[PDB]
């Protein structure tokens, strides 16, 4: 099917510039901030093991991401 | 297979390895199902 398309070019505002507009009043265009501001001017020896014997620019491999995965996947 | 040959089923059995076996030739009369 061809109805699913990438954009070849974006719609230009020049088209709307020629249209005759309507008088709808939008809530976001109501008066607000009407004034501008200006600047001035032995138990330890019986085991086989023991003492007796970083940022990188790649999210998917940063330690932060690894600990996130270890924390949320179990 | 090579390891075995380098160290030197049955009717009604399930073949566990069927996906790796050689293809059975099409005999000249194709069955209606095929």
């Amino acid at each position: 099917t061809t109805s699913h398309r990438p954009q070849l070019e974006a719609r230009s505002g020049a088209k709307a510039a020629a249209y005759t507009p309507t008088g709808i009043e939008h809530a976001r265009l109501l008066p607000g901030h009407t004034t501008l501001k200006y600047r001035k001017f032995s138990w330890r020896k019986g085991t086989a093991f023991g003492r007796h014997k970083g940022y990188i620019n790649d999210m998917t491999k940063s330690e932060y991401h690894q600990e996130f995965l270890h924390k949320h996947v179990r | 297979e090579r390891y075995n040959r380098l160290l030197e089923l049955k009717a009604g059995d399930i073949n566990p390895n069927a996906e790796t076996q050689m293809a059975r030739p099409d005999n000249g009369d194709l069955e209606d199902e095929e």
Binding site: - | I14, A18, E19, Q21, A23, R24, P25, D26, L30
Partner: protein, 47 residues
């Protein structure tokens, strides 16, 4: 008549349909490929 366990031996005809199907659907649509085969599942076609 239903078929609950699929498999058996791969015939040549099945291999040829599988190859034609892969040429069309690629290698990530094994259910669509197996849908053309009567005796084989998606996982068996992928294998």
């Amino acid at each position: 008549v239903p078929i609950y366990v699929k498999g058996g031996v791969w015939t040549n005809v099945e291999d040829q349909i599988l190859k034609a199907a892969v040429q069309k659907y690629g290698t990530h649509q094994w259910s669509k490929v197996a849908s053309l085969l009567q005796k084989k599942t998606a996982r068996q076609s992928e294998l």
